[PDB]
Design a protein around this ligand. Structure first.
Ligand SMILES: CCCCCCCC/C=C\CCCCCCCC(=O)O[C@@H](COC(=O)CCCCCCCCCCCCCCC)COP(=O)([O-])OCC[N+](C)(C)C
Lengths: 208, 117, 106, 332, 339, 331, 335, 105, 116
């Protein structure tokens, strides 16, 4: 057809091992998050559950096509064929995506090479809770993510002004807490393998 | 696209009648058919349905045993079957198909039956 | 069996004013309530499929409103081609209809 | 430049044999190891294990994966580990481990132009650590993590710490709830099995239990309950019900506190320091109740009494203060 | 070789097929007809605000690339041609951890009718979220929702509909009741359009109406509270000179009420509001503490050949304290249990 | 040699083998015979209302594409060829969480008989769901089933039967449950009808009466002699108020502590059990003893030995009548 | 290249190799030599009647298709080669859930010598079944087994042997004892034939002899019961007239002995028979109830007021009968 | 070590009746005994391996048995050519042997 | 399938004797080779063990030092070394092949040594 030959021309001569601009410039990734429901904040084990719609947007010059079709709205079958960043959550004790009835992933590729990759995640991230002045306690529960293998010279993350978005905030399982507000930060951490750009979302919680 | 029905007819009481409903522009294998009883200067009343992919028919309880629903696969049509007509059964009959939200969007031109002397 | 009740039976309003219209269901219907356009000596034409979801090919002035039981059809400005009676029909179960409310112009 | 990188990576992975270790007939490959401790979660006595999350990292040299034109280090995708040889490093004292898989599998390869492969993983492991609880809760646990190669002997691979003192870091910023990491050591050696001699690294921590929580909710209630037992000596001997009720409820609370702790620890067959203290406290309380029994027998019993409870007002605070001197001089 | 024909048919149907594209990608909107068969409405976890519903999740759509002409009009193939063809990416909006069952072969089927109509069912266990409001615990009623929509595909690409009439498109099996303390009254379905940052999506909503049964809580909490506050009335018929007996009554009833108040809250989540059981327990605690204060006043008005007499305070409290408990208990059940 | 002929025979059998088609795809249904060697039922949890069952699940059908002539022996191939053969899509309808054992390899057996017959067997641990009627707990018997059904193939495509008749299930007479005891097991072959067609079903079900002596050692004897403990209060004199009130109050608190402590290991069932009825009756007896003392104090110090002598006879006589009613209605 | 010599040896070994067929499928019997190195004998779960064991399960067999001639006599290869050659389908007969560890790589071994002799070592954590008879609890000993054998190949196809002498073919490491409640007395191996529905199979048994230590239950059960009995008999030395004092001895000892009886039978799973600990609890629970009945009899005979002959008899009869019961019970069950 | 204490030294009975042997072990040997015959001026030949397994060339009259500690070898209708010495050994540990049971007329 | 031994030896006490047996029809690298001592009118006594594929040897503690067992690969032969011969060493020696379920399957004809 028309989309079949476009996809077959895009995926010929393609290496998913190499990031876009492997020796030219760092890959700029614009992340957006949509928090469904911040789950229970456990105090005896010091973590909280969060359910989000993690979305990332980057540019790939190898995925450029010239056609009357503007966007290729694809399913999760095409995610493992192209390069995706190795984003991991640095304070997550355990997390999983959702795989029923299909891998809950999205991939949309524009005609200028812009790739949007959205997936659904459930994260048990650590949140250190001070127990002094219990129960008049205010916390900034973080959620830090970065690329695992790619340093600052290869992948640079960057938020969107309205990247973080919460739902109705009333069906959430926050029993004894209350969602006050959120703030986003970025920073560079230094490890034993390089310097990595780390993006943090802080969830401020006051106890009821 | 286009739904066609039979012409208006005159039938004696106690006899039978067969009224065809022709559908064109789409096969009936994916959508249900609906037949609506419409009394003169009165509201709409539903008679029955059919799944042409299975032949399954369900009826209004007050029309049970009065109408029988038949669909021909090759001729792309559906046929009324009314057995024991009374003198009260003088109305117009409407042919409709199921749409996007279980709503009858495409309707036929209608056929007024008349039972008199 | 789910019965549909429409009120009021008739009204005579001038061209260009707001006309509201009400339908109610005996049992729960979710959003599967349809509205029809019955011009005299023509077949019914669909106006709103589902609760508050406009059909293609009808004017923008027809606005639907839906709930679990209360359903409202409103016209922002009635023109001279709206002299017809409206029918409310449900489809959550086997379909039934209302009585039909006529419209006329002074 | 992307075409040059593509043809170089294509040349490096063409003719590569996954089954042969770097230098399959020649010298053993040296694998240096870095560990970045991210968390220590669940140091546990009932299951005798501790959960450890770390950024495990290995570095060796493969002369087949060498390139000369490109002047920078190639961080490839995490899925090329299924095409390159990696060591078969395992943990002997392991129980349940995984590599984190959100949003992809948390591993990493960064090739270098000389041939050095920077392989790394993010591993949460539940390592076994047998705990010597004779002196609980004033104890000190030595928990370890034995890092060994499985299939390759000493003449096939050799292990070392990448730095040998700064190879494992992040330990000093670990905060545990009821423990406190005092020292950590890095030991390299060789273990000998019946199939061969294998290289080994071992990372060990010297945990120390915090006394304060236990000294407020296990020691001090028992001490106050033993003080409350001696109030019966000041109550007059004619009121039998008050002294009998005080002594009986003192015995009952002593029998309950011990049973409120042991169920939070293993089914060990030895006596722990807290159990020795709550046995001595039970002996003191039981002797107070038997002292009242002797007072009742010497007055209302064997008949046809102000000196026995006068002696017990002095003797009982002395020996229990003496028992606290002996107990806290041994277990310190 | 009597099978060679079917092998060739399937090789023709998979020849040149692109499974990354929905059918009618360039000309129409892929409509998917679905119906949920509840094999068994599993247990409701009130602590986690979640319920589990094992289902036979059926789906059906038209694919014109799979038309064929052969001996059998409908081909009941295996579940392995399901990964070779395009299938909709339906996901559950309020799900937490769902498991397609894999034993022994993967529990899906695929039937390809000769006109191109596909049927694709699968068995699943969906642990979902049922936000609960606990103001009328333990005689509250809930409507646990089950929303499912087309991830990746917007209302202009994939729409969903019920394959039967919407009152008949979710069927619970007669034996589908693994509910211990609840009562599944019935199910209601709905259809809607959610709007997100990526587009407008069609969502299919199913509500399961549950009503809790007060059989565990009457035996466990209500009857011991009633027996404890009746046990507090026993201390009124004793003598004023039995000070240890009546203070043993008072402190043991107070300790019993405290341990009942502790052991009635752990069955619930740690919410920030008082349930109806908490309002029963608080009034019972007030009536126990009032009996203790009653004995305190009687003992304060106790003097001791003149002999002590019975208390006018105890004579009125023998009648009024059982009466004002029965007045409260008649209006508590009429307020909550009736409506 | 022989392994040169076996290799070309097995390579000839699976070359052209279409795994997407069942045997006799356009013709009669295939008959799949099943026998189960039960290893051991791990446990029967009442809280989750399930039971864990380890079994040697074996199936037996005849595929005519896997028929060879040259080799005169039953080929036992490696277990990984079963991913290249057609196997029936047998599932368990009341399954909750189950797995095929995978140490040291995947625990499954393949065997090609020279007439094309296949002996696919697996070692399977099912945590099957078993809804329990606890209205007579702990003096109950349960009926836990395992529901074996084909998923994708109707009765026009597959047929199920127990191979060997009543001797298909072997090993049920050797299992030792610690709390229950297997009374009978039955083998049932049915056809169930769904909206997508009519499917065959085999049902294996056990009857599990509960051993009672643990509950005498645990609950029935403390609850039966706290009641004995409350009758010491009739022997104590009337003026000893502290002793009789202390005895009655501690027996009441002990009975309600026993009643709260026991029901923490039972699901929140909305119906009363047998053991709850017994504990409620013993609580009524203890409460009536304390109210008898209250009626005595109120009678002497509120205006006696005859009432205390009458309650010393009636209370052990009525409690034995309660035990004769309870232990003859529930036994 | 320098490493191409081993590459072509491996590609010549795998050329025309059928891993679906055991060596000597139509000619002989595949003998497999097995030994076990127990790196840690894990904790024994009393409730589930199971135990955990960590091993280095080794198997060795002769394959004539993997003969090679090269500069190296033994090909020490990785785990990827073991999925392309025939390996025996050994499974544990009484296992419940065992994990073959694969962190960071699969914990396997493969060494192909030049005559075709193979070696295949694995790391496993077997949760096997140990059927227990808790009739002498807690003074009981066990014989927890570990039975393994082939799954699909019968006695006429694949047989199993021990590679060393059977007394030395199961080795337990010195530091490897994660037992806290029991202790390991020794190992015991045996080989036999099991008959099943499909055929006769060679099964290899390893018996691990355990013996429970009573240290915990002589602090959390036996000694509180003895102290409860002793404190229930110090009420004989009191005044006869102190009715609430002896009443509160009787009721508090009966309630705490009931609480000890509940918080004891609950430790283990629900069995129908009675342990030795339940017999000790029942005799103690009879002794304290007899002390209560003694006080009830004395109080029915109180009215100055002389001491009671029943108290003077029960000051002697109760502790000597408790000592006689202890000297009978402990000498019966420890021997 | 393991000590084999097979008894008796010799039995003197006729031809055509049932005669049994016995072998008692000091420590555990589990189904790992082996029975050999010893003719005068002849090397030992294997008869029974394991506990009760008949070797090739052994007639059906030679039936063995075994247990954890007690072992026996039963002969059914012993003939004139079976008049030799019988040996009991073990191989669960490093191998040891018994004294020897002879046969006489 | 045949294990052929050496001849009878007669040497003075205090000397050393070389004793050997050759296995044919198979290879000794698969199965262990066992040595046994049979005193006249006495029971059998085990001498030692050798694994020819591994080179490991294990001996009777009462026979440790005075006897050792060697082997070679090309000739497929098991050898004995006897040192400090005395009057109690007059016996007949067999070499026994390890068999099915550790059974001492094959036996040699026997070499009788005598001192004087
Ligand atoms: C509520 C608090 C109460 C506090 C009380 C305070 C005072 C007392 C305080 C403490 C002292 C006692 C507790 C010590 C516990 C540790 C020692 C131990 O377990 O010993 C051993 C018990 O071995 C046996 O055989 C058990 C014998 C039981 C005797 C019971 C007491 C006497 C009963 C009649 C008395 C009344 C008769 C007359 C009545 C008138 C441990 O054995 P093991 O470990 O199993 O095995 C050996 C180790 N090995 C395997 C490595 C070889």
């Amino acid at each position: 057809g028309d989309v079949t030959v476009i996809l077959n021309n895009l995926l010929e001569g393609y290496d998913n091992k190499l990031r876009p601009d492997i020796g030219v410039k760092p890959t700029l990734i614009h992340t957006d998050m949509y928090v469904n429901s911040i789950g229970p904040v456990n105090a005896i084990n010091m973590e909280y559950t969060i359910d989000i719609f993690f979305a990332q947007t980057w540019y790939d010059r190898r995925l450029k096509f010239n056609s009357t079709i503007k966007v290729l709205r694809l399913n999760s079958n095409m995610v493992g064929k192209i390069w995706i960043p190795d984003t991991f959550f640095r304070n997550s004790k355990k997390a999983d995506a959702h795989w029923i009835t299909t891998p809950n992933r999205m991939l949309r590729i524009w005609n200028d090479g812009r790739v949007l990759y959205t997936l659904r995640l459930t994260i048990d991230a650590e949140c250190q809770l001070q127990l002094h002045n219990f129960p008049m306690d205010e916390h900034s529960c973080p959620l830090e993510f970065s690329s695992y293998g790619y340093p600052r010279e290869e992948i640079v993350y960057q938020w969107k002004r309205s990247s973080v978005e919460v739902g109705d905030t009333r069906s959430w399982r926050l029993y004894q807490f209350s969602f006050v507000g959120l703030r986003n930060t970025t920073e560079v951490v230094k490890t034993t393998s390089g310097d990595y750009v780390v993006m943090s979302v802080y969830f401020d919680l006051s106890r009821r | 696209v286009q739904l066609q029905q039979s012409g208006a007819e005159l039938v004696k009481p106690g006899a039978s009648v067969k009224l065809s409903c022709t559908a064109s522009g789409f096969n009936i294998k994916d959508t249900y058919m609906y037949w609506v009883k419409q009394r003169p200067e009165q509201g709409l009343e539903w008679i029955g349905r059919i799944d042409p992919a299975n032949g399954d028919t369900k009826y209004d309880p007050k029309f049970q045993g009065k109408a029988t629903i038949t669909t021909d696969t090759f001729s792309n049509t559906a046929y009324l079957q009314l057995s024991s007509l009374t003198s009260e059964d003088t109305a117009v009959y409407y042919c409709a198909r199921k749409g996007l939200r279980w709503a009858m969007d495409y309707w036929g031109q209608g056929t007024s039956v008349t039972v008199s002397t | 069996n789910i019965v549909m009740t429409q009120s009021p039976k008739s009204m005579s309003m001038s061209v260009g004013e707001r006309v509201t219209l009400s339908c109610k269901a005996s049992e729960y219907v979710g959003t599967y309530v349809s509205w029809y356009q019955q011009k005299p000596e023509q077949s019914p034409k669909l106006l709103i499929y589902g609760a508050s979801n406009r059909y293609t090919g009808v004017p923008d002035r027809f606005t639907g409103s839906g709930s679990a039981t209360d359903f409202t059809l409103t016209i922002g400005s009635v023109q001279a081609e709206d002299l017809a009676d409206y029918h409310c029909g449900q489809s959550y179960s086997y379909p039934t209809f209302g009585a039909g409310t006529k419209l006329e112009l002074k | 430049n992307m075409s040059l990188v593509k043809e170089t990576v294509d040349r490096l992975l063409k003719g590569y044999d996954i089954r042969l270790r770097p230098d399959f007939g020649g010298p053993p490959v040296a694998v240096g190891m870095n560990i970045d401790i991210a968390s220590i979660d669940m140091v546990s006595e009932v299951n005798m294990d501790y959960t450890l999350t770390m950024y495990f990292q290995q570095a060796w040299r493969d002369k087949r994966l060498s390139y000369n034109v490109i002047p920078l280090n190639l961080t490839l995708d995490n899925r090329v580990a299924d095409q390159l040889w990696v060591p078969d490093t395992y943990f002997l004292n392991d129980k349940k481990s995984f590599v984190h898989g959100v949003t992809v599998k948390n591993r990493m390869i960064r090739l270098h132009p000389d041939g050095t492969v920077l392989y790394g993983l993010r591993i949460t492991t539940t390592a076994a650590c047998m705990m010597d609880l004779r002196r609980y809760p004033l104890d000190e646990q030595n928990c370890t993590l034995e890092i060994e190669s499985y299939g390759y002997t000493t003449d096939d691979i050799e292990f070392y710490w990448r730095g040998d003192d700064n190879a494992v870091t992040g330990v000093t910023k670990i905060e545990l709830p009821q423990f406190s990491i005092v020292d950590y050591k890095l030991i390299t050696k060789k273990v000998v099995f019946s199939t061969g001699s294998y290289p080994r690294l071992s990372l060990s921590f010297k945990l120390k239990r915090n006394i304060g929580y236990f000294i407020l909710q296990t020691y001090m209630p028992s001490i106050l309950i033993t003080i409350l037992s001696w109030v019966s000596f000041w109550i007059n001997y004619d009121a039998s019900a008050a002294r009998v009720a005080l002594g009986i409820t003192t015995v009952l609370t002593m029998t309950t506190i011990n049973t409120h702790l042991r169920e939070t620890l293993p089914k060990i067959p030895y006596v722990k320091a807290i159990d020795m203290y709550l046995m001595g406290c039970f002996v003191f309380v039981f002797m107070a109740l038997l002292e009242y029994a002797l007072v009742n027998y010497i007055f209302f019993g064997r008949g046809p009494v102000n000196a026995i409870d006068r002696w017990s007002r002095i003797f009982f605070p002395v020996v229990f203060s003496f028992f606290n001197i002996v107990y806290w001089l041994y277990y310190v | 070789d009597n099978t060679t024909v079917f092998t060739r048919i399937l090789d023709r149907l998979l020849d040149g097929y692109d499974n990354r594209l929905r059918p009618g990608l360039g000309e129409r909107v892929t409509e998917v007809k679905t119906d949920i068969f509840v094999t068994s409405f599993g247990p409701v976890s009130d602590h986690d605000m979640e319920y589990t519903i094992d289902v036979f999740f059926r789906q059906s759509w038209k694919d014109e690339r799979l038309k064929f002409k052969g001996p059998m009009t409908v081909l009941r193939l295996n579940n392995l041609m399901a990964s070779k063809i395009w299938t909709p990416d339906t996901f559950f909006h309020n799900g937490k951890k769902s498991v397609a069952h894999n034993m022994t072969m993967p529990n899906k089927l695929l039937r390809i009718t000769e006109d191109g109509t596909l049927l694709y069912t699968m068995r699943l266990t969906v642990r979902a979220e049922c936000p609960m409001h606990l103001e009328d615990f333990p005689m509250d009623a809930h409507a646990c929702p089950l929303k499912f929509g087309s991830y990746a595909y917007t209302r202009a690409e994939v729409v969903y509909e019920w394959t039967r009439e919407p009152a008949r498109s979710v069927v619970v099996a007669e034996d589908g009741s693994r509910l211990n303390q609840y009562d599944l009254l019935g199910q209601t379905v709905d259809s809607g359009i959610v709007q997100s940052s990526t587009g407008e999506y069609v969502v299919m909503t199913t509500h399961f109406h549950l009503k809790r049964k007060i059989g565990y809580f009457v035996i466990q909490t209500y009857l011991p509270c009633i027996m404890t506050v009746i046990l507090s009335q026993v201390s009124f018929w004793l003598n004023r000179e039995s000070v240890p007996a009546r203070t043993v009554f008072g402190v043991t009833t107070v300790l019993t009420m405290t341990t009942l108040s502790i052991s009635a809250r752990n069955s619930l989540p740690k919410v920030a509001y008082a349930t109806a059981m908490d309002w029963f327990i608080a009034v019972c605690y007030a009536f126990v503490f009032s009996a203790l204060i009653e004995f305190a006043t009687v003992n304060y008005f106790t003097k001791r050949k003149t002999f002590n007499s019975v208390s006018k305070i105890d004579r009125l409290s023998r009648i009024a304290f059982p009466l004002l408990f029965g007045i409260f208990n008649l209006v508590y059940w009429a307020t909550y249990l009736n409506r």
